[PDB]
Amino acid sequence: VIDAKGLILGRLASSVAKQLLSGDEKVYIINAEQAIISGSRAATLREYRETRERGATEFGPYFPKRPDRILKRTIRGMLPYKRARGRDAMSRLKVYVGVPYELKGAETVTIPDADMRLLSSSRYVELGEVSQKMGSKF
Amino acid sequence: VSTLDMDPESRRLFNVRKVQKGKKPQFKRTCSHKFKRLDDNWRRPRGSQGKQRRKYVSKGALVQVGYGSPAAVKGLHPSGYSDVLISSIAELELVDPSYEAIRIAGTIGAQKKALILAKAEEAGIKVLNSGR
Amino acid sequence: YSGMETSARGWGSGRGVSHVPRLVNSSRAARVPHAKGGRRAHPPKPEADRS
RNA sequence: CCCUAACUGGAGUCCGGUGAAGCUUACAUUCUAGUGCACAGUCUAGAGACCUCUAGGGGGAAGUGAAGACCCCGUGGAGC
RNA sequence: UGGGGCCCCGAAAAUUGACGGGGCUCAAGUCGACCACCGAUACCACGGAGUACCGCAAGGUAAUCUCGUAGGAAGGCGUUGUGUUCGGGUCGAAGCAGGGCUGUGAAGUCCUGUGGACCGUUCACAAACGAAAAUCCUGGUAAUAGUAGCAGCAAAGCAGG
RNA sequence: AGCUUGUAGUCCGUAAGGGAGACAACCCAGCCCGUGGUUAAGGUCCCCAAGUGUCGACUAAGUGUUAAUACUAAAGGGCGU
RNA sequence: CCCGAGAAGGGAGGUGCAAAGUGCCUGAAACCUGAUAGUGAUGGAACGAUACGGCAUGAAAGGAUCUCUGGCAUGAAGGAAUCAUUCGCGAGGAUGUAGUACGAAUGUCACUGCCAGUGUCGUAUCUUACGUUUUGAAGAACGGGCCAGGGAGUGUAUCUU
Ligand SMILES: [Mg+2]
Ligand SMILES: [Mg+2]
Ligand SMILES: [Mg+2]
Ligand SMILES: [Mg+2]
Ligand SMILES: [Mg+2]
Ligand SMILES: [Mg+2]
Ligand SMILES: [Mg+2]
Ligand SMILES: [Mg+2]
Ligand SMILES: [Mg+2]
Ligand SMILES: [Mg+2]
Ligand SMILES: [Mg+2]
């Protein structure tokens, strides 16, 4: 159980991907909408709106809108998910927005190196705001 | 029923050949599995663009003398006893059972093969093919 | 003239078959060493001197 | 033709009987971009994709038919 | 005011898409240095094979040998038959399907099943002597496919026995 | 001009294996077989084995994350830093 | 003798060492039908090479100090961990411990009954088929639907080595 409040998206995704590729633990990532993405808000929204409206309707990348599914997608990128190792790793990963009912009272561990206060600027937006501006309801 | 007369140098060479011919590839022809017209025997690759003739490591192993067995134990049976193809009873009088072992001819009938095996059992030569 | 007393001629191109000689009234190939019933390319000669 | 509609008979669709042919190295559920002899379903990186069947018209397979009939070359021909 | 580093505007293209992708902001980018590790068939070592030359032979040397198209040279495997030596076979030959063993390999030999009459080998010698391919040739047979056709020019049949 | 025509060297053609995402000829490397070890090129956040490595600065533009290169936009300007 | 409308055909039954059972010797592959093993309706493709596992087989031809699991002796190349000292802004280095413990392999003693192999499937790395024309081929260049058999340096005369 990883509390993703105030954590960088890529650093959290890389840490969780390596942990799942260690290959034993089911990892729950609560508060996925409160993850941080560095860079200016205009560039972040421009990249995410370009990636959202990319593919074809029969073939193209159906990039998600929910924050938990976007975080799941980002962790999916840093895995060999087309392999059996990657498939097992993605089956052993659950991402939630907010705190689900079965995780109330549970114990959490947050990544030290993926902290958002290690950054040295005000240029960031949360993953929840990017999901909300992509039209998501969460 | 005799002790194999193989010195420890030839025992080491025999075990060396056991390992190295365990690791030796089968040397099938290129693309033999794709077409049913092709056989399982080795034909040298000849096309200018073929990947096996270019010695791609993913395409197999080229036939070459580096794969050869050790010179001392080459041609020996996996039991270690040297092989002498016996096509008649007269070939049992020019072989000694201290380090060898016979192989009876395939076309031999029971009538003469029984005599061959009786003469080998009385003489002591090891026999690889027989019945019981 | 073993395999060679035929009067076959090729069909040329434009028919989808090979260019080998074929009979004047059927498509069966003749007279070449790889056609069925064709002449033996390089057969023994009675004028050879084996002595 | 604007602008297509309805109806008739024969096909087609479905059913019983009979019953061929043409493409085909292999695999093949694809889509994008790059690379590659500079026009890739098979390579590289991603994205999608449960399988099987029926009907549909033809986007693609640089679809099939065919040793290009245009241009050049041949110390190749023919006719004039 | 001059000389520099990075960045910015200048900067518009046609299927959705390319830092290889995810993503990354005192970096997971750029610059000046540094440390430790990873990572080849290279290098080292061990055991083995082949080759080159030398040695009568055992054997000796090779850091100064081991990739390879056109091509030259050498040595071998296989089919059919002749001379010659030695043979196998109804107590089951050849051939055929699978498998074990040997050999770098060509291939050889062996075992299981079927078969019903011939088949090899030593030393030499000959060839109508080895196929994966020629829009190759002959034969057999698929996929297409239970599909097209069995309609257009004369739409012809139904009841009873 | 990934144009055409030369010259010196080295390559592909006829060149494996390792690495650049793929890459005829770019880097290591020229290669008999098996095992062990250590390195070359290049890399060490994940995909991917090994650094969320150290020191001193820069960049705020997702610029960049592209040795060579047919694969990488200029002149001009900036009281951007 | 039975079924069948049946001089078809099928079963039962018999002749024959053997159905070899009327283009009938052996009876391949392509192609087709059924069974067995593995996998299978979440799945990525030159169909394979290498290593490790699951399932099935492993009777013959393969192993019986052979297969599995450990101790001891000698151990090439390489070479720690831990601890102490000292240096270094730091990551870390040097020195000693120590060329120690270990380390491919070569022997020996216990221990065990499987192993080599075969079929299929999965996991990890690598490979875009073959021949040809090509400077360059996986080519959207040419050839092949598949299988079997046939299919290409031969003789005379003359010159040269
Ligand atoms: Mg004839
Ligand atoms: Mg032409
Ligand atoms: Mg001319
Ligand atoms: Mg040659
Ligand atoms: Mg053929
Ligand atoms: Mg009708
Ligand atoms: Mg060069
Ligand atoms: Mg060269
Ligand atoms: Mg290379
Ligand atoms: Mg050429
Ligand atoms: Mg043939």
Which tokens belong to A87?
């498939």
Please answer whether residues A55 and A127 qualify as being in contact, where contact means their C-beta atoms are separated by less than 8 angstroms.
no
Q: How far apart are CA C23 and CA C28, in angstroms?
A: 6
- Cβ–Cβ contacts within 10 Å for residue C2, how many? 9
CA-based nearest residue to A27, from A82, A94, A78: A94
Q: How far apart are CA A134 and CA A44, in angstroms?
A: 12
- Cβ–Cβ contacts within 10 Å for residue A61, how many? 11
Radius of gyration of chain C (CA): 14
What are the CA-CA distances from residue B128 to residues B102, B111, B131, C7 (Å)?
6, 18, 10, 63
Q: How far apart are CA B69 and CA C47, in angstroms?
A: 52
C46 CA vs D21 C1’ separation (Å): 50
Beta-carbon contacts of A132 under 8 Å, excluding residues fewer than 6 positions away, are: A138
Nearest nucleotide (C1') to the CA of residue C16? E135
Burial of B119 (0-12, 13-18, 19+ CB in 10 A): middle
For A76: left if phi > 0, alpha if psi spans -120 to 50, otherwise beta; the answer is: alpha
- Cβ–Cβ contacts within 10 Å for residue C23, how many? 14
List the nucleotides on chain G closer than 7 A to a protein CB: 29-30, 43-44, 46-51, 60-64, 66, 106-108, 116-118, 122-134, 136-139, 146-157
Nearest nucleotide (C1') to the CA of residue C17? E135
Resolution (A): 2.9
A58 CA vs D47 C1’ separation (Å): 11
Nearest nucleotide (C1') to the CA of residue A10? E23
- Consecutive H or E run containing A126: strand A124-126
Considering only CA atoms, which residue is closest to the C1' of nucleotide F45? A14
C21 CA vs G140 C1’ separation (Å): 34
Please answer whether residues A96 and A26 qualify as being in contact, where contact means their C-beta atoms are separated by less than 8 angstroms.
no
Tokens 């005000």 locate to A122
A118 CA vs G89 C1’ separation (Å): 23
A126 CA vs D44 C1’ separation (Å): 34
List the nucleotides on chain D closer than 7 A to a protein CB: 25-26, 30-32, 46-49, 65-68
Does residue B43 approach strand E to less than 7 Å at its CB? Answer: yes
What are the CA-CA distances from residue A115 to residues A9, A33, A69 (Å)?
10, 15, 21
Which tokens belong to C35?
């056609």
Q: How far apart are CA B78 and CA B80, in angstroms?
A: 5
- CA–centroid distance, C20 to ligand 6, in Å, is 47
Does residue B55 approach strand E to less than 7 Å at its CB? Answer: yes
- Strand pairing category for A36-38 and A124-126: antiparallel
Measured from the alpha carbon of residue B37, the closest ligand is: 5
- Residue A20 is classified by DSSP as H
Which tokens belong to C47?
């004028």
Please answer whether residues A97 and A32 qualify as being in contact, where contact means their C-beta atoms are separated by less than 8 angstroms.
yes
Measured from the alpha carbon of residue C5, the closest ligand is: 1
Edge-to-edge strand list for the sheet holding A2-3: A2-3, A27-30, A93-95
Q: How far apart are CA B112 and CA B105, in angstroms?
A: 10
Please answer whether residues B92 and B120 qualify as being in contact, where contact means their C-beta atoms are separated by less than 8 angstroms.
yes
- CA–centroid distance, B27 to ligand 8, in Å, is 27
Burial of A103 (0-12, 13-18, 19+ CB in 10 A): middle
B84 CA vs G1 C1’ separation (Å): 62
**Elucidation method:** cryo-EM
Cα distance from N-terminal residue to C-terminal residue, chain A: 20
Angle of CA points B120, B123, B125, to nearest 5°: 55
Please answer whether residues B12 and B33 qualify as being in contact, where contact means their C-beta atoms are separated by less than 8 angstroms.
no
Q: How far apart are CA B100 and CA B96, in angstroms?
A: 7
The three-class DSSP label of residue B3 is coil
- Cβ–Cβ contacts within 10 Å for residue A63, how many? 16
- CA–centroid distance, C3 to ligand 1, in Å, is 5
